[PDB]
Structures are given as C-alpha cells and as structure tokens.
C-alpha cells in the first residue's frame, strides 16, 4: 500500500465529486481546481479554463485535505448515449506530486464512472509530458473506436496527442493490487505444484568417475521430462524487437518530448497543401519512420540516420530557409546530433 | 532501463539464462552460481564449482499448458508481471513483453476469457491444483514442436509481410461541421456566445485555503460573501445564454439557405409585414407563429383580391375569363404607353380552403385556421352553350341545362315553352294528353315528347 | 476477504450505502441535466463538412431582429385593425365599356360594336314576342322573352323526382270559368302585387334593380370573398389582443431587468479593484452595494415570480398553444362587439 | 267575368309548418333575395337545397304547389290591398 492508501484510510485526505450547482463548498472546490489547472497549463488562455471548469455539463473529482485544501483532480464530460467520456483536464500540485496520488485518483475516477453509469471508452488529448503516466494507467495511443462515434463531439486541442482506454468490465480498480496478487499467488502455486527444480539430483553419472565430457540434455531423465529442445533453447535468446529497441525508444521519447520537434509530429495534409507531395517524392514524418521501425524495415542504424536527414531535407525543400520551418529543422538536426554524440557508438557516423 | 525486472547472467559463459533451462549448483560453497545447460553439458567450471562430487538442481522453464492450451506457464506469468508493471489494461507493452507475436487483440481476449470473463472467479481454474488432466493430455514435445512451427511461420510472414501504411494526419473532430462559422452541433454550443466576456470577472478569482465560516461570528466573513455574490451574476449570465439558445433551436433559425430563399420568393408588402411581425416569435411556439403569419398574409391577399374585383365590376366586365383577358390587354397597353395569391383568389375555380367558414356558427374558430337522362333524339347534334351566346344561362337549373343542350334550344324559348305548358296544365287541373303537349310545343314531335316526359318526371304536370 | 466486484445501484437507497458503492465519499445531489438544451441527436457527423461557411457576423445580424427589446413603437403595430368600410361595398354594372373609355384618348371611337341583340345595353330584361312567332328556326335565336320577374319566379321552382293540383279546380263550375288576356308588362305587375300580399316582398312606401346585373358571375365571387374577409378580421383582432396582453408583462420585466443589471455591473466592478490593487477591510461601498442588490431582488422580484416571463412555450410539451379556443371565443366576441360599436359610431 | 281568386292560406300554412320556424327565416330571406334579382341559380340551390331535403318528399312538393298557386292566381281577382291578416 502506497502512502496515499494509508492517508485515505486514516482520514488525512478525502475525495469529493462536485459540479457547479451553486452551493458554497462546490464553488470553493471548483475554484481550487481552476487555479491548479491554470498553474499547470500556462499556455492555454485563462478564460478558456475558467469557462470549462465552471460549466454545468462537466463533472469533477477532487482530492480534498482536512482543512478544505484541494491537491488535485480531474474533469470530464460524459456522453451517456454514445458510451464514452471525454477527459478535458488533469493535474496534481507540484509540491505534493511526490506522494504518488495520480494512480489512486485515476483508479477512483474509473471506479466511480463504472459504478455510476454505463460508459466504456475514455478519449483524451494527452499532454506532451503526461504520456508516460497515461500509458502506465492503461491508455494506449492506438484508437479502436469508429470515426462516427467521436467526430463532431470531442474538441481538438493543438499540441495534444489523442489516446483511448477501454475499461475492463466488472472489476474493481481500487482493489486491483490484492486481487492481482492473489491471482499471481494461485498461478505460482500451480507452477510450483509441478516444477521439479526442488529435487537435488546427484551429479551426472558420466561425471561420477571424475571425467567431464559433453552430455546431451535430452539424455537426462529430468531434462527429458522437462521438454528441453535445442531449437527452443536457441530461440528463447532472441528478443522480439530489435536489439537496439530500448536505446532507440529512449531516443524517440527524448525527441518527441523535445519542443523543437513539434512540426514533424504529424504528417502534412494533402487537402491543405497540394504541392507538398508533388515536390517531395519521399515525404517522411516521425510516424512513418516509427511504423517502419515497428516493421523492422530498417536493417541498420544508417537507415534511421538517413531517414532523419531526409526528413530535415524535405522540411528545408518545401519551406524556405528564411522561413522558421527550415531554421527549426536545422535546430532539430543540431539536437539529434547532440543526442547521437552523447552515444559513443553513433558518434562516428557524422559526415565532415 | 524502465523495466523493473532482473536480468540473470551465467557465471561462466556470461550468457543470459533467465528464459532457458539451466542448472544451478546446490553446494553451499557456491552461492547464486547458475550454469547454463551448455555450460553444465560441456562442463565448464569456474570459481568453487566442482562438477565431480557436488549435487545440482535443474531449473525448468515450465513449458506446458495449464490454463489455455495455446499458452504456457511462462507466458501467463509474463502477462501477470506486465499487468503489475505495465498496469492492467495497457495491452501493447504487456503483449510485447510476453512474446510469441501475440498481437494485443489475442492477449486481450486471452486475459479476458481466462480471468475476467470466464466460468470462474478470482480463484483460477476449475477447482484446485489436484486436477492435472491438461498437462498429461499433450506431451511437452508436441507442444514445443507446435510452438516452434508457429513462431517460425509468424517470423517468415513478418519478414514477407507488407510494410505498414504510414499514419495519416489524425482525424481532428473539427466540431465546426455545421454550415455556420462557429457552431458545434455535436455539443449544441457556439464558439462566441451572448456574453463571452462574462468570465473576465471570475478568471482570476482565488479563495483563501480552509476558510468559509468566521471562527467567531458563525456568519460568512465579508470578503467571502463579496466573493460569493460575484458568482451569482455569472450563473445568471449562463442561464440567459441557455434561454437564448433554447429560443434559437425552435423556429429553425439555423437554416440560412431555406429561410433566405423563402423570403426572396415573397413580394414586397408581404416581406414588410413579416419583418414587422418578426419580434413576437419569442412568446409562441412554431405552429402558433406560422398560423399568425399565415393569417396576416391571407388577410392582405383577400383585401387585394376584393379591390381587384371591385375595380373590374365598374368597367362592365361580366365574367372572370373576360376579366383576365382585360387585365392582359391593359398590361399590354400600359407597356404601349408563378401567379400570386391575389391572382389565385380570382381564378375561375376557387381554392378548396375558401369554401367553408373559418370560425363556425357558435363562435369557435376551426382547428385548421391557417338524374333523368333523356335519350339523344335521332338526328340531334348538341350545341355548346356559352355565356356570350346564352343571356339567361345563369338561372337554369343543372338538371335542365343538359336537356337544353341535348335538344338544341336556347334558354329564353325554353322558359317561354315552360310557361305556356304550365298555364295550359294548370287551367285544367294539371292533367293533359300527350297530343296536347305535342301541339302546345309547336315543334318537332320528338322535342315536344322529350320535354313533356322531362316535365312529368319532374312533377310539375301529370299525364292524363 | 473483501468484495472483488462493483455492486449495482438500486432506487431509493441510503446515502451511506451509496457512498459504499461509489467509494468516493461524496457525489452531487442534482444532476443538473434538466438545464441541457437537449440530448445530442445521436447522428453520424463523419460526413464531409461543407467547404463554404457563412461569416458569423452575417448570422448574428440575421438573428438580431428576433431578440430586440419591446418598445411602444411595436406596441402600435398590434392594436391597429385597419380599414373596415371600403372592402364591403357592392358596386353596380358600369355604363361605359372598358374599350370605349380606353378609346377616350384619341380618335378610336369611329367603330361601333354595339351587339345587334344587345340594343340599349340590355339584351335581357326586355320581354319581346309571343308564342305566335315561335318557330324551329327562331328557337335557336333569343328573339323571344317573358320579362325578368316572371323568369325569376318560374325558375324559383325546383325539380324533384302532381304539383299543379289546386284545391277547388276539379269542379265543372271552375271548368266553365273564363279568363282575360293580359301581357307581360301586366303579368309582372300582378305577380309583384301577389308577392306583396303574401309577404315575400316589401310593403310599398307609406304615403327591382334588374338593370344592375347584381347576380353576375363576378358578384358571387365578390360576395364570397367579402364573407371570407369579414371572417378573418375578427380572428386577427383576437390574436393581436392576446399578444397585447402578454407584451405588457414582458415590458415590465424588461424595465426591472434593466435596473438589476446596472447594480450587478457595479457590484462586479467594485470588487475587481480589490484584486487589482491586491488591497485590508472591505470598503463601505462594497459593503452597502450588496445589501441594496439583495433588497431590490428579494422585494421587487417577487412580483415577477411567475415562471413564464422568461420561457418560450415548446411544441413537444403538448397543447401549449397560447391560442386556446376557450379564450379565443371570448376574444372574438369582444372584438365583434367593438366592431359593432365602431360601426354604430361611424 | 273574371273568376274568383284561389284560397292561399292552407298552401302557405302547410309550408310554414313543414319548413320549421327555426330555419324558416333563412329560406324566406334567400327566396326574396333571389326574386329581387340578387342571386344566381347556383347560390339559391346551394342555400335552399338542405332546407327542402326530405325522404317523404313533402317539402319540395309544397314549394312547387305554392309557386304554382302564385302563378295561377294571375288570372283572377285582385286581392284586398295590404299584408294578409292571416300571416
């Protein structure tokens, strides 16, 4: 149990669900949430946040201290007839963030919505630095909902990244820990009921005389009953992704987090501009290269380096050097060269 | 590495042995000394390991079905461990961690069927560990061969699989799909509202932490009440916005094209009248406003038509057809020097909806406010009767005009014959002989016969 | 030990068990959903949106006329009933044909097209000839008549499917009777006297407009339309009277709101300065404006407590028409009374 | 030489009884208006046919009888001037 759980049990904190009815406590809680959200999202205008939080159709789940002090909360607008809800804000005060209230708050919100209505899917426009939190809380960047369900209903947010989470029916997320632990305990007990690793077999009969020679694993009765095969033994050492998947994932997360790679986040639309495809015969963006990497089409790091260089070249080709597009492209080039230089392996691939 | 797992490396060959069958030395002299099967097969020893007189344990990978025939113990354990780490629901990462090229859909369905949606509860499987039917049903070798074949086939397919299509630009909702700059039909909200500057007074409001009630008086402290009083006005502004929207939705004021076209089609005076009557829509529903406007238009059209007919009657025009002809000729003359309601009311055939009182006799307005055939005599060719030819046509009954046409006789001679026959019959109690009527008519025998039969059938005379 | 699933909710359950279900230890009481303008129509908006929107300025200017405040200028549109004398006149057939008056601008009268049978402009209404001249050849020509009054009397009969059986005529004594020989100009006078005796015609002045063509085909249409117009004017008057009844209370509410809003603005702007300067005690002005606002609201606004002063009746609710027959009947009766009084004055 | 008039009291009393004093004023007004020459056959029929409708057919017969009496009296004595007392 994390500190949040014990604080809740002992009454240190407490959750409240409040809407703009017009009472006294509701207004205080809503104003506190408004202040926190304004603090955490300085880019968006304050009037927009004030209008959204104080609306009569949105809800709000907040965590309130004993002397009526609000630490954090979430806002959402449920579309009851469409079987999905939109999350419009989320934040926790920086000073109190270290405690780890985010998981507990998300679990409470999911449980409340599950036990009060019949919604299934959550759609949100995640921030550029909350993607890790959202991913750890079950969300995914891939959308499995039809275009008709959520088009014209939710609102776009420039600089966001849409995500979707499908709740698992008839589970209690608050008690996820104990339930999952008991399931794991039963699985482990079942495995132990058959595992033969507890038997201390004597040394190999071939080695009993003091001579050590190669022995076929299948010859030994225990190993033979274990089903060991050379094919599986050699196969189990091959990771699913590429051996450099982790390092390239670090680099990709670093570049996506970087505010200098915003223009390349999504591809250019054919409707908005017509000459973009006519001028560039190899239009490349971060999404396309990421998908191709997922396909393992990039056999060598030279492929990724060339893809980045060609992205920069296309950006400079379609947009003039004087315009900020090409300057930002060159700055992002200086940035990925910085990151590569931080990697000794790829430092030698920079041309003169 | 973000993964919280532990990587196990052999103490001789320095090769990962976490996901493979290995052998560990059980001698106390060796602590956490793991030997890979090749190491314990080739017998490469290091440190204090003695492969000659020290017992060893065999670490099995636990490769056999337990819950699902297509899934083994290792895959289920990885599933649950990822749920612990990646969280229960983030299916992509957990599926990748498990391995076996099980797409997120297959992993999701497997977990659902085995743990969430099953004939089972958080105590897994049927009853207890004592049930060992599935493990003995299929030998380990067969399952391993099937797994190897499936993995090889999937790897070959992926190598030969087509490249993924590049992601298109994300499908932005763009709620402005309505035919109006700044309207969101899916949310029923405008982008620029009635008093969009109403937030300018409450977008900087902050509240003292933990306050709300005076520690001494028990009443809200002055600053608190002043702050509260400036939220009531904001709520009232929101309510006014809502009422304005509610009025807008009714009457279909969101159809610019239809309303503009209908307004264009109308004439000048009707347009002025509608523009004058526009403001009162707020107090009525759709049907009431439609009835109001239609009544005004009907009154105007009736006035125009009555004036037109009064103008006609003074020029000696004695029929609607000639009236229209004269109007056309007057248009042509004034040039020398679809039809409107006023042009429909004066048509030779009146509209159906003008043949019954609008408000009935007892003062309650209506809810919807706004024959003897004479045979054709031989050698008789009927002649059409025209208002210009027949002077007194407008008096003959419908049952007699057909006879007049069929008999080739003008109205006034027919009336004179009727009068003479009536006098002759009445003089003698009303009974007369057929030759009597034949002589009285003073025409061909068939004509007099037919007129006499018509009269006797009518009942104004009796045959002797 | 603990329950692993979510218990479903049930109606009319205790608050503590509600919080047990929810686990959030609170919840809103009023869902506030009744203030929704209406549930989204639940459609498929994925259809390609139009590429030509109309500037919001044009739409705002288009809907502005529907929401302007009521004024005495538009309180006179209604309360006006129009003209009610000229439409109800019945002119007689004119003398000069339209062609002649048209020709009365140049030398176009040289041609006379007087109908040969329409001499004296009255082809009808002139008895001529007798049964002696009746002939098959002449039967096709309207050279013989019987006079207007006799024609009207004879055509007054109706054909059914004898009617000349007189009470005492069956006697041979009546059979022996003789008669004189009158003429149409005398028969018409005799019939006039007879109908005078019966009572179907007015008694003569204390001591017949057949040339006006008052039954013409145009006259029937004119009478029909005059009836329709007199029918419609009363209904219009009733509707306008009801609208007058509502507009006055609406105006009173306008006059109250226009003074409430000024106090709202003053109390709102007397606090922004506190945030601006960031201060200290609440000012005397800010203390005494709140009491004034609350006094005004709580006392005066009680008069307007009726819910209909700010709402627009909806069709979906049912018979929400403000033109119910039970009141339209009385409004129409009062309007008819006023019309009769005006006619008597006029 | 001129024969006597024909009694008319019964022929009119029967008509008044048959029509019914309820709808009688409309019938009288329409008939007098048509006689004066302010209607056409269409309007007169439209206005009077409902009043004279019957299954036994003793209303149209009385109407025709009254008209025939009025016409046939033409060749008899001139009555005493003034509205008849029996009205």
From TrEMBL, chain A:
Coiled-coil stretches, from where to where?
none
Under SUPFAM superfamilies, the record lists: Acyl-CoA N-acyltransferases (Nat), Bromodomain
Q: Where in the cell is it found?
A: Nucleus
Enzyme class of the recorded protein, top EC level: transferase
User: A single Gene Ontology molecular function, please?
Assistant: histone H3 acetyltransferase activity
Q: Which InterPro entries match?
A: Acyl_CoA_acyltransferase, Bromodomain, Bromodomain-like_sf, Bromodomain_CS, GCN5, GNAT_dom
User: Known EC number(s)?
Assistant: 2.3.1.48
One cellular component term from this protein's GO annotations in UniProt: nucleus
User: A single Pfam family, by name?
Assistant: Acetyltransf_1
Q: Which GO terms describe its biological process?
A: positive regulation of transcription by RNA polymerase II
Q: Which domain of life is it from?
A: Eukaryota
Q: What is its main location?
A: nucleus
Family label = Belongs to the acetyltransferase family. GCN5 subfamily.
Name of the featured protein: histone acetyltransferase
Q: Which organism is this protein's natural source?
A: Chaetomium thermophilum (strain DSM 1495 / CBS 144.50 / IMI 039719) (Thermochaetoides thermophila)
UniProtKB/TrEMBL annotation, chain B:
The record's listing under InterPro entries reads: ADA2-like_ZZ (IPR041983), Ada2/TADA2 (IPR016827), Homeodomain-like_sf (IPR009057), Myb_dom (IPR017930), SANT/Myb (IPR001005), SANT_dom (IPR017884), SWIRM (IPR007526), TADA2A_B-like_dom (IPR055141)
Report domain HTH myb-type positions. Answer: 71-119
Q: Which residues form the ZZ-type domain?
A: 5-64
- Protein localization: Nucleus
What GO molecular-function term can you cite, just one?
transcription coactivator activity
Please state every residue range assigned to the domain named SWIRM.
376-464
One Gene Ontology BP term is: chromatin remodeling
Annotated ranges, domain Myb-like: 71-115
Protein name, please? Transcriptional adapter 2
The species is Chaetomium thermophilum (strain DSM 1495 / CBS 144.50 / IMI 039719)
From TrEMBL, chain C:
Disordered: annotated span: 107-132
Q: From the Swiss-Prot or TrEMBL record, state where the protein is found.
A: Nucleus
Give the family, as the similarity comment puts it: Belongs to the NGG1 family.
Q: What is this protein called?
A: Uncharacterized protein
Its ancestry begins with:
Eukaryota, Fungi, Dikarya, Ascomycota, Pezizomycotina
Q: Which residues of the intact protein are shown?
A: 264 to 730 of 730
TrEMBL record, chain D:
Native organism taxonomy: Eukaryota, Fungi, Dikarya, Ascomycota, Pezizomycotina
The protein, known as? Putative transcriptional coactivator HFI1 protein
Compartment annotation: Nucleus
**Full-protein interval shown:** 54 to 140 of 485
This protein's species is: Chaetomium thermophilum (strain DSM 1495 / CBS 144.50 / IMI 039719) (Thermochaetoides thermophila)
Judging by the UniProt lineage, the source's domain of life is Eukaryota
